[PDB]
Paper text:
We first determined the crystal structure of the N-terminal extracellular domain of [name], from strain J99 (19), to 2.0-Å resolution. [name] contains two predominantly α-helical regions—a handle and head region, and a third β-sheet motif located on top of the head region. We term this β-strand unit the crown. The handle region, containing both the N and C termini of the extracellular domain, forms an α+β unit. The N-terminal helix (α-N) forms a two-helix antiparallel coiled-coil bundle with a C-terminal helix (α-C1) of similar approximate length. The core of the head region is composed of a four-helix antiparallel coiled-coil bundle, similar to a tetratricopeptide repeat motif (α-1 to α-4), at a near perpendicular angle to the handle region creating the markedly kinked tertiary structure. The connecting features between these four helices are (i) a loop containing a short α-helix (followed by a disordered region of seven amino acids) between α-3 and α-4; (ii) a 20–amino acid loop between α-2 and α-3; and (iii) a ~200–amino acid segment (including a disordered region of 8 amino acids) between the α-1 and α-2 helices. This connecting segment, which extends out of the core of the head region, contains a small β-sheet (β-1), a pair of interacting α-helices (α-1a and α-1b), and the crown—a four-strand antiparallel β-sheet at the highest tip of the protein (β-2). [name] belongs to the Helicobacter outer membrane porins (Hop) family, from which the crystal structure of the functionally related sialic acid–binding adhesin (SabA), from [name] strain 26695, has been determined. Whereas both proteins share highly similar three-dimensional folds, the four-strand antiparallel β-sheet crown of [name] is altogether absent in SabA.
To achieve colonization of the stomach, this Gram-negative bacterium adheres to Lewisb (Leb) antigens in the gastric mucosa using its outer membrane protein [name]. The blood group antigen–binding adhesin ([name]) is one of the best-characterized adhesion proteins of the bacterium. It contains two domains: an N-terminal extracellular host-binding domain (7–9) and a C-terminal outer membrane–spanning domain predicted to form a β-barrel structure similar to that of known porins. [name] is a predominantly α-helical molecule with a markedly kinked tertiary structure containing a single, shallow Leb binding site at its tip within a β-strand motif.
Numbering used by the authors: 27 to 282, 291 to 402, 410 to 527
Write the structure that this text describes.
């Protein structure tokens, strides 16, 4: 029906006009602009300062927890071994402590006679990288991640591994840097995400014939102590990225609710899962990058002239570019947070990926009130043990409860946009008036509805707003009825 598409289009334009009219009025009133600025500063505080209630916080935590939890699921089946520099070995057993091994709190790398590499055992050089990122993330998680505003917190992280078997060179002087492998230390300054961290490495050899040594073989124990490791969102996301990308780059052989595939290469059988976790990390990294835009454009100073001069939007609005940047960056943090959520939420997935997330990644086999984050037990293997299911919930609920601020963010965006482009938006209001005036002349027997909009010149405006635009409410209500009837 022609006449019905007419009335619909007219109703929609009248609504548009009315909203644009209001936006122009708001943008010329410092008391309204100040209330919206105050709201914008308070939402920024919430996003960057809060934890439980911040979708930004929840999204970062979720990206990190997914990467740790992915390793706790698949680590026990992933093959590793060999000697230094990625060389095959004859009899090298290298054990990494506080790792989610098969019925163990260590992972044993003991694949002899095959060269490490793609579709083979992970090299010890790569396992070391993976294990250091893992231990940093688990220590940080156990203690609790700080609010996004707190970018200078520090944590100390200690871990140990052992080497046994004839010819194992993975704990030798040359590899570790100690003066003496039997009883030795080395301290250095290590760079972690651009920060200087003090690293202490210690080496000792435990003889098969030493007291308390119930293994009956002799072995080297390496301890690594990192002091002052950054625990910012940015830094922890970089560790998560190293964890996942090391797994992907090494693409190791594995052999094993059950997995869809029980032998293969990790980057093949778990490619869908890796894909999601890389995207989650990357979106969280971009979310955290918005923080500096928000922090650069503070909303604390009231606007308008403080001496007597009426506010002129054409000339008194140089704050608006900062306000638009702030509001847009908050909008973007919200959108990205939701994208991190949607990548992993089992409600949105199907097939083997849904099963991987519900039956493995989002559960914890640890005995209990649940175990604390960052805990590795002899049962961890095959389950995420990283609060993944609860963090998915907490991210959903923080986004739904951020609706108040989400509206305030949009209001600030619209108003700062209008200010930045005031001449052009004021001109669009007039062009929307012209389009309406045209549509009204092309509806039949509508002689009485021609007043639906009107305007008046005001050459005296102290604000340069020389045309006042009006909506006749009776004509509008009549038009709204006709349109409902079709």
């Amino acid at each position: 029906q022609d006449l019905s598409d007419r009335y619909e289009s007219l109703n929609n334009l009248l609504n548009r006009y009315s909203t644009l009219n209001t936006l122009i009025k708001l943008s010329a009133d410092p008391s309204a602009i100040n209330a919206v600025r105050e709201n914008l500063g308070a939402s920024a505080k919430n996003l960057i300062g809060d934890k439980a209630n911040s979708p930004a916080y929840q999204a970062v935590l979720l990206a990190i927890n997914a990467a740790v939890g992915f390793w706790n699921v698949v680590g026990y089946v992933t093959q590793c071994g060999g000697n230094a520099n990625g060389q095959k070995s004859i009899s090298s057993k290298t054990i990494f402590n506080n790792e989610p091994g098969y019925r163990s709190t260590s992972i044993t790398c003991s694949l002899n006679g095959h060269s490490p590499g793609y579709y083979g055992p992970m090299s010890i050089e790569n396992f070391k990288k993976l294990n250091e990122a893992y231990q940093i993330l688990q220590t940080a998680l156990k203690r609790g991640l700080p609010a996004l505003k707190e970018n200078n917190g520090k944590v100390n992280v200690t871990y140990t591994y052992t080497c046994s078997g004839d010819g194992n060179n993975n704990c030798s002087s040359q590899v570790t840097g100690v003066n003496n492998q039997k009883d030795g230390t080395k301290t250095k300054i290590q760079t972690i995400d651009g920060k200087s961290v003090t690293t202490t490495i210690s080496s000792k050899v435990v003889d098969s014939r030493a007291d308390g040594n119930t293994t009956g073989v002799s072995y080297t124990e390496i301890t690594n102590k990192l002091e002052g490791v950054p625990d910012s969102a940015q830094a922890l996301l970089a560790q998560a990225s190293t964890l996942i990308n090391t797994i992907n780059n090494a693409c190791p052989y594995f052999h094993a609710p059950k997995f869809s595939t029980t032998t293969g290469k990790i980057c093949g059988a778990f490619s869908e899962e890796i894909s999601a976790i890389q995207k989650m990390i990357t979106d969280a990294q971009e979310l955290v990058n918005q923080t500096s835009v928000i922090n650069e454009h503070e909303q604390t100073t009231p606007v308008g002239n403080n001496n007597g001069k009426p506010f002129n939007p054409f000339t008194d609005a140089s704050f608006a570019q900062g306000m638009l940047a702030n509001a847009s960056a908050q909008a973007k943090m919200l959108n990205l947070a939701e994208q991190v959520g949607q990548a992993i939420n089992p409600e949105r997935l199907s097939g083997t990926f849904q099963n991987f997330v519900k039956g493995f990644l989002a559960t914890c086999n640890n005995p209990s009130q649940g175990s604390a984050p960052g805990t590795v037990t002899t049962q961890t293997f095959a389950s995420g043990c990283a609060y993944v299911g609860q963090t998915i919930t907490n991210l959903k609920n923080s986004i739904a409860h951020f609706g108040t601020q989400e509206q305030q963010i949009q209001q600030a965006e619209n108003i700062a946009d209008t200010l930045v482009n005031f001449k052009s938006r004021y001109s669009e209001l007039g062009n929307t008036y012209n389009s309406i005036t045209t549509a009204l002349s092309n509806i039949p027997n509508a002689q009485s509805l021609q007043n639906a909009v009107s305007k008046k010149n005001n050459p005296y405006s102290p604000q340069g707003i020389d045309t006042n635009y009006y909506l006749n409410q009776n004509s509008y209500n009549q038009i709204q009825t006709i349109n409902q009837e079709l």
